[PDB]
Design a protein around this ligand. Structure first.
Ligand SMILES: C/C(=C\[C@H](C)CCCCC(=O)O)[C@@H]1O[C@@H]2C=C[C@@H]1OC(=O)\C=C/C=C\C=C\[C@H]1O[C@@H]3C[C@H]1O[C@@H](/C=C/C[C@H]1O[C@H](C[C@H](O)[C@H]1C)[C@@H](O)[C@@H](O)/C=C/CC/C=C/C2)[C@@H]3C
Lengths: 49, 159, 50
């Protein structure tokens, strides 16, 4: 299952991106949860999307 | 069997801590879950204490298992299947068994192989992952500075 | 993900090993670069920008 989208700060400001041809962006983070049904284990990890 | 803050070993997630005993009910029964977060993967694991032994969470080893794997790692004359695919499947199963003696046997065999030859990217990742989780289990079984535990494992390997 | 939830062995998987973010990042990249509704912004005056 998936849960909780959440962003970070941008990696570079606007004018530096226009200078060095980088794209203005920010990373996505997602709390993922893997559930086994028979024994039963949940696993919470912060997947960089 | 367990309290809060105890160090424990999983099948293969390295050693870990229990952070709390979760009382999350399910189907209207307050099953005694336990949050158990690990070191390497930076993830938590919730397991009910009923099937804790069914999934096979294992308490840390002591001095008897310590010198047992110190004699297992020092034990010579281990033969190997010359079919490398059977070898890879075999020690992959032995690594996934979660047994400390089997993990020590795997890392000492693969150390004796790549010490002479230098094996593979896959076998090198195999040795790296298994040696890492065995070093973590050693540095939480004796609590003696995992870098220094790595050096003392290098000491008893060539000895 | 639902393919490799079977061929991978049980009590061995983790969500870091399940998810491949490559189709999502490729879909975002192919949407912005080279798609006819994501246009190169013209600016010869602020009225034409607006
Ligand atoms: C035909 C068309 C766009 C034309 C290229 C431009 C508009 C045609 C109308 C006109 O003749 O004025 C369609 O556009 C989209 C869907 C598919 C079609 O694209 C198409 O099938 C054709 C191209 C689709 C993407 C092209 C990307 C690259 O092609 C070059 C570089 C990249 O983007 C293009 C940038 C176009 C900006 C234009 O802006 C217009 C003026 C100039 O013609 C251009 C500066 C302005 O009048 C502006 O107000 C109008 C914007 C169009 C509104 C959105 C339409 C949806 C530039 C031509």
């Amino acid at each position: 299952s998936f849960s909780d989208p959440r962003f970070d700060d941008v990696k570079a400001p606007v004018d530096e991106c226009k200078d060095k041809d980088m794209t203005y962006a920010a990373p996505l983070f997602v709390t993922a949860e893997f559930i086994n049904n028979n024994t039963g284990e949940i696993k919470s990890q912060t997947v960089f999307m | 069997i367990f309290k809060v803050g105890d160090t424990v070993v999983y099948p293969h997630h390295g050693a870990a801590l229990v952070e709390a005993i979760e009382t999350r009910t399910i189907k209207g029964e307050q099953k005694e879950y336990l949050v158990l977060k690990v070191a390497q993967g930076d993830l938590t694991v919730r397991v009910p204490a009923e099937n804790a032994e069914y999934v096979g969470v294992r308490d840390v080893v002591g001095q008897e298992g310590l010198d047992k794997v110190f004699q297992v790692l020092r034990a010579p004359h281990t033969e190997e299947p010359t079919n490398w695919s059977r070898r890879y499947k075999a020690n992959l199963e032995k690594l996934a068994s979660g047994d400390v003696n089997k993990v020590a046997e795997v890392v000492r065999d693969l150390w004796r192989r790549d010490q002479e030859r230098g094996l593979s990217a896959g076998e090198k990742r195999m040795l790296a992952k298994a040696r890492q989780i065995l070093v973590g289990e050693l540095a939480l079984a004796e609590s003696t500075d995992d870098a220094k535990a790595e050096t003392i494992l290098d000491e008893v390997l060539a000895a | 993900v639902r393919e490799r939830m079977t061929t991978q062995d049980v009590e061995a998987i983790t969500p870091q090993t399940l998810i491949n973010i490559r189709p999502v990042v490729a879909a975002i990249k192919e949407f912005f670069g080279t798609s006819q509704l994501s246009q190169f912004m013209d600016q010869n005056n602020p009225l034409s920008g607006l």
